[PDB]
């Protein structure tokens, strides 16, 4: 593309600073002056370094430019260069150019410089197979796969980038100048064949591993390889770490963020010396037996069987609880088999919780004091006490036998868990309580059945007396019949005791008492 009629510079080159540079180039006076295409065509070189140039629009009118130095500017676009075929030298350091799709048709390009352009994608360069010098230092490059095509390069610079994989260079045997410092390289095997190197730089590498769990024995494979394939021995290992065969080892007893080692190894490939150095960072029957109770087995059910283990099987019955009936005891090892709770008696076997109780039972459940008369019916085995056996204050009184034969007056009643008790007296004086089944109450009120018969007193029975109850014991004697000698007697009640007939007499006036019918007359 070109202009026909003369035209001013400013009219063609929008970017002032760039117009200015043209002016000087064409030796012109002022940016205003006009120029012809033929004057534009006479331009083959352009040196505009650090010229605060934001754009180069219009440079499409210099079809014969071959050298172009625009280092240290403010460019970001290069679409104008697109058709500048004869371009052979092109420097664009310190700029912000990222779209390279404009360089694909510059097949005569010999040397390219793009240092400090904040580049990361360079797949575009693949169209410049004839390049001889390439500068990409200080960018954000990680993948140099496409450089494998640039087999005419003798000079290549990629330092201060994020490169890790350099296999893409294994074939560039034509290389003489190679800069790879400040990258993430840790393997130089890929460089083993560059026999034509004169300049080689590999210092300050930063290699970051993938995090691993922290340990106290920590072991990390040394992954730094020489051109050879041999492991590079670590110069300086952090945290007092040591180095064995191919592993770097740490003792890290406590815990730390990361660990690391430093490598420094002079290498030579071709006729070039270099220092391969950098750092590698490594990110990192139920029994409740603890109790002691104080219980007293319920006197009753003293036929409670004791077992070895909390189970109800006679084959495991250690015996029978009954020999320990009235003592303060101590359990310990509790339990719960089949749902029911069991107990372990100190030194004694195992029984059920029901069987054992809280304290020395005494509850009589009632103390009445009815009316009756008994006689010891086999004392063999029983005694007489202060208030029913197994009861507060209940002391002792002679054996039951000590009262046999004699008539005992029933004064009271009782009924504790085992049996019913009868307080009693003899000769009027009270004695105590006794198991009612040991006695024979030959007389009970329930035996007093009513009637309505009439009688008088016997002249021969006048000496006989009458009582309060149909029992001829002195303590219940209430008088002598002879007091009624010839009065009318009304027999209202009656009772048959020990086979004899008694009547309860009374005058139409006053109540008399009980007397044997054998002493009266209806006559
Ligand atoms: Tb302008
Ligand atoms: Tb530089
Ligand atoms: Tb540099
Ligand atoms: Tb450098
Ligand atoms: Tb050489
Ligand atoms: Tb040490
Ligand atoms: Tb640390």
UniProtKB/Swiss-Prot annotation:
**UniProt effect for mutating residue 24 to A:** No Ca(2+) binding, no change in Tyr-phosphorylation of host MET, wild-type invasion of host Vero cells
Under SUPFAM superfamilies, the record lists: E set domains, L domain-like, Prokaryotic SH3-related domain
Localization in the cell? Secreted; Cell surface; Cell membrane
Q: Which InterPro entries match?
A: Cu-Rt/internalin_Ig-like, GW_dom, GW_dom_sf, Ig_E-set, Inl_IR, InlB-like_B-rpt, Internalin_N, Leu-rich_rpt
**One CC-aspect GO term:** cell surface
User: What did gene disruption experiments reveal?
Assistant: Deletion of both inlA and inlB prevents uptake of Listeria by human enterocyte-like cell line Caco-2. Single inlB deletion no longer invades various cell lines. Decreased synthesis of phosphatidylinositol 3,4,5-trisphosphate (PIP3) in green monkey cells, decreased infection of host cells, decreased association of host PI3-kinase catalytic subunit with tyrosine-phosphorylated proteins. Deletion no longer Tyr-phosphorylates mammalian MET.
Q: Where, in this chain's numbering, is Ca(2+) 2 bound? A: 20, 24
Main localization, broad class:
secreted
One MF annotation (Gene Ontology) recorded for this entry: metal ion binding
For the region Ig-like region, give the residue spans.
Answer: 206-284
Q: Which residues form the LRRCT domain?
A: 206-284
Q: Where does Ca(2+) 1 bind?
A: 14, 16
One Pfam family for this entry, by name? GW
Locate the LRRNT domain: which residues?
1-41
Q: From the UniProt record, list the LRR repeat ranges.
A: 40-62, 63-86, 88-106, 107-128, 129-152, 154-172, 173-196
Q: How is the cofactor bound?
A: Binds 2 Ca(2+) ions; binding site 1 has a 10-fold higher affinity binding site 2. Loss of Ca(2+)-binding has no measurable effect on host receptor activation or invasion by Listeria, suggesting ion-binding is fortuitous.
Region spans: GW repeat region, necessary and sufficient for cell surface attachment, interacts with host C1QBP and with heparin: 293-523
Oligomeric state and interaction partners are given as: Monomer. Interacts via its LRR repeats with the extracellular portion of mammalian host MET; MET can bind HGF, its endogenous ligand, and InlB simultaneously. Probably forms a dimer upon interaction with host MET, which subsequently allows dimerization of the host MET and subsequent host signaling; dimerization probably occurs via the convex surface of InlB. Interacts with host complement component 1 Q subcomponent-binding protein (C1QBP). Interacts in vitro with human intestinal mucin-2 (MUC2) but not with mucin-1.
Role according to the record: Mediates the entry of L.monocytogenes into normally non-phagocytic mammalian host cells. Its host receptor is hepatocyte growth factor receptor (HGF receptor, a tyrosine kinase, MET) which is tyrosine-phosphorylated in response to InlB in human, green monkey, mouse and dog cell lines. Downstream adapter proteins GAB1 and CBL are phosphorylated in response to InlB, which also causes cell colony scattering. InlB binding to mammalian cells is saturable and inhibited by EDTA; InlB-coated beads can be taken up by host cells.
Q: Which PANTHER family match?
A: LEUCINE-RICH REPEAT AND IQ DOMAIN-CONTAINING PROTEIN 1-RELATED, LEUCINE-RICH REPEAT-CONTAINING PROTEIN 9
Which protein family is it in? Answer: Belongs to the internalin family.
Q: What NCBIfam families does the record point to?
A: GW_glycos_SH3, List_Bact_rpt
Could you tell me what this protein is called?
Internalin B
| Organism whose genome encodes this protein | Listeria monocytogenes serotype 1/2a (strain EGD / Mackaness)
């Amino acid at each position: 593309e070109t202009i026909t009629v003369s035209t001013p510079i400013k009219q063609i080159f929008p970017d002032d600073a760039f117009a200015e540079t043209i002016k000087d180039n064409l030796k012109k006076k002022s940016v205003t002056d006009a120029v012809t295409q033929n004057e534009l065509n006479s331009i083959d070189q352009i040196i505009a370094n650090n010229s605060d140039i934001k754009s180069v629009q219009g440079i499409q009118y210099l079809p014969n430019v071959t050298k172009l130095f625009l280092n240290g500017n403010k460019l970001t676009d290069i679409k104008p260069l697109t058709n500048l075929k004869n371009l052979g030298w092109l420097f664009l350091d310190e700029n912000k150019i990222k779209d390279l799709s404009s360089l694909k048709d510059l097949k005569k390009l010999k040397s390219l410089s793009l240092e400090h352009n904040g580049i990361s994608d360079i797949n575009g360069l693949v169209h410049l197979p004839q390049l001889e010098s390439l500068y990409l230092g200080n960018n954000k490059i990680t993948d140099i796969t496409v450089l494998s095509r640039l087999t005419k390069l003798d000079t290549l610079s990629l330092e201060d980038n994020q490169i890790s994989d350099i296999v893409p260079l294994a074939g560039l045997t034509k290389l003489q100048n190679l800069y790879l410092s400040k990258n993430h390289i840790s393997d130089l095997r890929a460089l083993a064949g560059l026999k034509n190197l004169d300049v080689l730089e590999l210092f300050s590498q930063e290699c970051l591993n993938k995090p691993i769990n922290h340990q106290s024995n920590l072991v990390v494979p040394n992954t730094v390889k020489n051109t050879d394939g041999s492991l590079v021995t670590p110069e300086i290992i952090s945290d007092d770490g040591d180095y064995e065969k191919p592993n770097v080892k740490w003792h890290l007893p406590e815990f730390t963020n990361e660990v690391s080692f430093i490598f420094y190894q002079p290498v030579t490939i071709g006729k070039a010396k270099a220092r391969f150095h950098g750092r590698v960072t490594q990110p990192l029957e139920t029994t409740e037996k603890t109790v002691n109770l104080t219980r007293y087995v319920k006197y009753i059910r003293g036929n409670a069987g004791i077992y070895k283990l909390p189970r109800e099987d006679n084959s495991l019955k250690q015996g029978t609880l009954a020999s320990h009936r009235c003592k303060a005891l101590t359990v310990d090892r509790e339990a719960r088999n089949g749902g029911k709770l069991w107990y372990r008696l100190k030194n004694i076997g195992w029984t059920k919780a029901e069987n054992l109780s809280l304290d020395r039972y005494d509850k009589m459940e009632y103390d009445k004091g009815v009316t009756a008369y008994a006689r010891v019916r086999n004392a063999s085995g029983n005694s007489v006490w202060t208030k029913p056996y197994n009861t507060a204050g209940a002391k002792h009184v002679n054996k039951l036998s000590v009262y046999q034969g004699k008539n005992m007056r029933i004064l009271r009643e009782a009924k504790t868990p085992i049996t019913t008790w009868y307080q009693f007296s003899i000769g009027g004086k009270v004695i105590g309580w006794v198991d009612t089944r040991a006695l024979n109450t030959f007389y009970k009120q329930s035996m007093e059945k009513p009637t309505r018969l009439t009688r008088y007193v016997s002249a021969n029975k006048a000496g006989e007396s009458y009582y309060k109850v149909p029992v001829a014991d002195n303590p219940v004697k209430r008088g002598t019949l002879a007091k009624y000698k010839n009065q009318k007697l009304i027999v209202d009640c009656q009772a048959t005791i020990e086979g004899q007939l008694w009547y309860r007499i009374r005058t139409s006036s006053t109540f008399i008492g009980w007397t044997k019918a054998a002493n009266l007359r209806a006559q």
